[PDB]
Amino acid sequence: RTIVVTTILESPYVMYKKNHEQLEGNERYEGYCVDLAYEIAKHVRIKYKLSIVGDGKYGARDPETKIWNGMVGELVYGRADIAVAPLTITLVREEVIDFSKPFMSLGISIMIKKGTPIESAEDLAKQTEIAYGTLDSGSTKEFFRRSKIAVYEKMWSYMKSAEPSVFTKTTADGVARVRKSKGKFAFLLESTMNEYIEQRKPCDTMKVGGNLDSKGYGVATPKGSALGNAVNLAVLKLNEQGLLDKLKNKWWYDKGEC
Amino acid sequence: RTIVVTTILESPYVMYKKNHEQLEGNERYEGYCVDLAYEIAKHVRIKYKLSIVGDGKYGARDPETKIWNGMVGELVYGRADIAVAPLTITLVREEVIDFSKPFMSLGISIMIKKGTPIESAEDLAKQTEIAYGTLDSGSTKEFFRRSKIAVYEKMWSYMKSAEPSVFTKTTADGVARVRKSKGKFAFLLESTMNEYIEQRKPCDTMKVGGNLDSKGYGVATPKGSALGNAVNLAVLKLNEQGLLDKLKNKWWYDKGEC
Numbered sequence: 028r029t030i031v032v033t034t035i036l037e038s039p040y041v042m043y044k045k046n047h048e049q050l051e052g053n054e055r056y057e058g059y060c061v062d063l064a065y066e067i068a069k070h071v072r073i074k075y076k077l078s079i080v081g082d083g084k085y086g087a088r089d090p091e092t093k094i095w096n097g098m099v100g101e102l103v104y105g106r107a108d109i110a111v112a113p114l115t116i117t118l119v120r121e122e123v124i125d126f127s128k129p130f131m132s133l134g135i136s137i138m139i140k141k142g143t144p145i146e147s148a149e150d151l152a153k154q155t156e157i158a159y160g161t162l163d164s165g166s167t168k169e170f171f172r173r174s175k176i177a178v179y180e181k182m183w184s185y186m187k188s189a190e191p192s193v194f195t196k197t198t199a200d201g202v203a204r205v206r207k208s209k210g211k212f213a214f215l216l217e218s219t220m221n222e223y224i225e226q227r228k229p230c231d232t233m234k235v236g237g238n239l240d241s242k243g244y245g246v247a248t249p250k251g252s253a254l255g256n257a258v259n260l261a262v263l264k265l266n267e268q269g270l271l272d273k274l275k276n277k278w279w280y281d282k283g284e285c
Numbered sequence: 286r287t288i289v290v291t292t293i294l295e296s297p298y299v300m301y302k303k304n305h306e307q308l309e310g311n312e313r314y315e316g317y318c319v320d321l322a323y324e325i326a327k328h329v330r331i332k333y334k335l336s337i338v339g340d341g342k343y344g345a346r347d348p349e350t351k352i353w354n355g356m357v358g359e360l361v362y363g364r365a366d367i368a369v370a371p372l373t374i375t376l377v378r379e380e381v382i383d384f385s386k387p388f389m390s391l392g393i394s395i396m397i398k399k400g401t402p403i404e405s406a407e408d409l410a411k412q413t414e415i416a417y418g419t420l421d422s423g424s425t426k427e428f429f430r431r432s433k434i435a436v437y438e439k440m441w442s443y444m445k446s447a448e449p450s451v452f453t454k455t456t457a458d459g460v461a462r463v464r465k466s467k468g469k470f471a472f473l474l475e476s477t478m479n480e481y482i483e484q485r486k487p488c489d490t491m492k493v494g495g496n497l498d499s500k501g502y503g504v505a506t507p508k509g510s511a512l513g514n515a516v517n518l519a520v521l522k523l524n525e526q527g528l529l530d531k532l533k534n535k536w537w538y539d540k541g542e543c
């Protein structure tokens with residue numbers, strides 16, 4: 028009866044409540060995906076336990092050992108029944124799991140410290156004073172690894188050898204690093220996150236240029252699990268009801284500091 | 286599995302959402318008791334259906350036909366499994382139902398249009414220019430009917446014959462009547478409600494003086510129902526957790542307009 032939903036600590040999707048140690052279970056967290064979990068659980072009528080992924084990753088297949096980590100592994104190895112979070116819909120992932128219809132829209136985007144003299148991928152690629160990175164074990168890193176567009180080819184071979192490593196264990200590490208860096212570190216992340224951080228004090232970061240690509244997050248299920256159907260039917264309803272929009276404003280813009 | 290919770294449309298305990306016709310079931314409502322229902326249902330782990338009482342009353346025993354109306358009847362006649370709402374803990378009611386430990390504190394209080402020359406019960410009682418009333422089929426009306434304190438004796442025999450009737454079908458009718466009345470109608474209600482309306486535009490009403498008495502609202506159960514135990518254990522926990530307070534600010538003060 029308690030279906031476990033894997034998920035990840037990422038702001039403002041899921042974050043501990045101010046004072047969370049006061050509470051227990053699902054009540055410990057608050058966020059966009061935390062609101063999304065509840066109300067899906069409300070529409071497919073199910074008991075659920077939010078479970079934050081142990082390794083704190085999204086999910087990439089280890090090239091050598093062939094295993095899946097992050098929330099994607101959770102599902103694949105029968106540890107989670109469902110994933111509510113900012114998990115990008117990807118081909119390599121669709122081969123091993125199910126996605127609902129995307130519940131949010133994003134693209135890869137450049138995050139800069141304010142003032143940094145950069146506007147575009149090409150701007151980043153054609154120089155070497157400003158360093159740049161991405162989240163490790165996510166779809167952004169994979170996008171650059173997989174790409175055969177020349178500018179991205181260049182930006183990839185650079186990162187792949189950059190020392191120290193330009194791949195971060197978390198999103199907050201990139202952000203912290205963009206901010207500590209005095210303009211010598213750009214950080215490639217999803218524009219959803221990017222715009223979240225743009226609205227956060229101390230208001231010293233921003234998105235520059237268009238997204239390199241256009242995709243979305245989906246709720247995920249183990250492959251062929253019978254629960255995909257309902258889950259997806261609930262997403263499509265939340266959209267038509269106007270409720271994803273409501274939550275998106277609530278978490279990013281209404282809370283907005285800059 | 287779906288335990289029905291009887292409850293009543295009273296602001297800000299339970300109120301339709303802005304545009305509610307967009308939604309269905311429990312999602313149609315929002316309010317303090319709506320938040321309280323959920324999270325009790327969360328702590329005793331139960332599926333529930335919010336059900337707004339048909340006659341829209343609290344509960345009084347008809348003197349003649351001996352029957353109970355309002356949410357209290359619901360419980361007594363096995364129609365509701367539980368009552369989440371501003372139901373005052375009373376002796377006559379405790380004889381026929383169970384109350385948790387009170388989840389909120391109130392007292393009877395005078396509501397006046399701003400400017401009205403009234404400060405106290407005695408002030409009301411000793412004059413006849415300003416008319417005054419209360420909610421029909423509630424504990425306030427009963428309090429005055431039951432009282433043997435002289436000033437309340439006087440205020441009762443007055444009301445009991447006042448034409449037109451000074452007993453209102455709803456709280457909003459008293460309020461509307463206090464506001465339409467240009468200072469010639471005071472309205473006796475619970476200080477919780479009173480302070481809610483004091484914080485509502487157009488900010489032309491207020492509480493005057495102390496409460497005539499001190500009591501509280503409890504979550505109610507059919508008499509000896511096995512569900513009292515848990516329910517009460519959940520209330521005591523919400524209190525110690527600081528969560529009733531949180532909700533009380535959220536619904537009355539943080540939303541405050543005056």
Ligand SMILES: NC(=O)COc1c(F)cc(SCCNS(=O)(=O)c2ccccc2)cc1F
Nearest residue numbers: 116117129130131132241242243244266271
């Ligand atoms: N909350 C929403 O309504 C957002 O939904 C959408 C949407 F309506 C359209 C798109 S187009 C971008 C590609 N579609 S995708 O994300 O399902 C995808 C991703 C990777 C490979 C193939 C298809 C995106 C949304 F998020």
Ligand SMILES: NC(=O)COc1c(F)cc(SCCNS(=O)(=O)c2ccccc2)cc1F
Nearest residue numbers: 374375387388389390499500501502524529
């Ligand atoms: N949210 C809260 O903590 C409010 O709880 C309380 C409380 F702690 C004390 C009182 S004293 C007033 C009388 N106690 S009663 O309401 O349980 C009652 C009512 C009628 C006859 C006998 C006893 C009130 C609270 F609401």
Ligand SMILES: N[C@@H](CCC(=O)O)C(=O)O
Nearest residue numbers: 085114115165166167217
């Ligand atoms: N949403 C990405 C993680 C963030 C990123 O790679 O920028 C994923 O599902 O892997």
Ligand SMILES: N[C@@H](CCC(=O)O)C(=O)O
Nearest residue numbers: 343372373423424425475
């Ligand atoms: N809370 C009261 C209704 C309001 C009033 O009588 O002022 C009751 O339970 O009956």
Ligand SMILES: [Zn+2]
Nearest residue numbers: 043047048055
């Ligand atoms: Zn902790």
Ligand SMILES: [Zn+2]
Nearest residue numbers: 066069070312
């Ligand atoms: Zn809903």
Ligand SMILES: [Zn+2]
Nearest residue numbers: 301305306313
């Ligand atoms: Zn309606």
Ligand SMILES: [Zn+2]
Nearest residue numbers: 054324327328
């Ligand atoms: Zn709780």
